[PDB]
Design a protein around this ligand. Sequence first.
Ligand SMILES: CO[C@@H]1O[C@H](CO)[C@H](O)[C@H](OC(=O)CC(=O)OCc2ccccc2)[C@H]1O
Ligand SMILES: [Cl-]
Length: 152
Amino acid sequence: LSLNNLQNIIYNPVIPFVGTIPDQLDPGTLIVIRGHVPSDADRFQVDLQNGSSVKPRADVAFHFNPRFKRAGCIVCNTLINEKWGREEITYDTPFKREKSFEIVIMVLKDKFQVAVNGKHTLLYGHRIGPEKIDTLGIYGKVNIHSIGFSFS
Ligand SMILES: CO[C@@H]1O[C@H](CO)[C@H](O)[C@H](OC(=O)CC(=O)OCc2ccccc2)[C@H]1O
Ligand SMILES: [Cl-]
């Protein structure tokens, strides 16, 4: 965790991206993801993970998954011991092919609060303790300009 917090920003990561989060996600922590949905994207996802194991797959405390089929949606879920739980689906989605976005994930004591382009998008209640999250995963069809962290 750099003293100059601007030095913790990750620029132009290759997708698929996996990175260690530089400190624990305590209440008040922000994760800021700037990017662009490329032409013909089907879906992309941001995963807050407990480790980087590929097989068996690392637990995912928070799966945030924009999908571009038909009217579009966002699917949120949690992965434990390689099995998905019950999906929470948001149909009021701000994501579109060939549009830029800024995602802000705010870690609260009880939930994640997600805003896109400065507007509230969704809430996701913690299912796994957020103190187990150490890894950020970005997968699918997206271009990421930058990843930043604001720790309390
Ligand atoms: C019933 O459909 C499933 O809904 C789940 C959420 O409810 C996930 O969205 C899942 O996609 C995935 O399993 C996530 C994915 O695209 O995998 C990429 C990946 C990342 C890390 C390890 C292995 C695969 C999708 O197939
Ligand atoms: Cl940062």
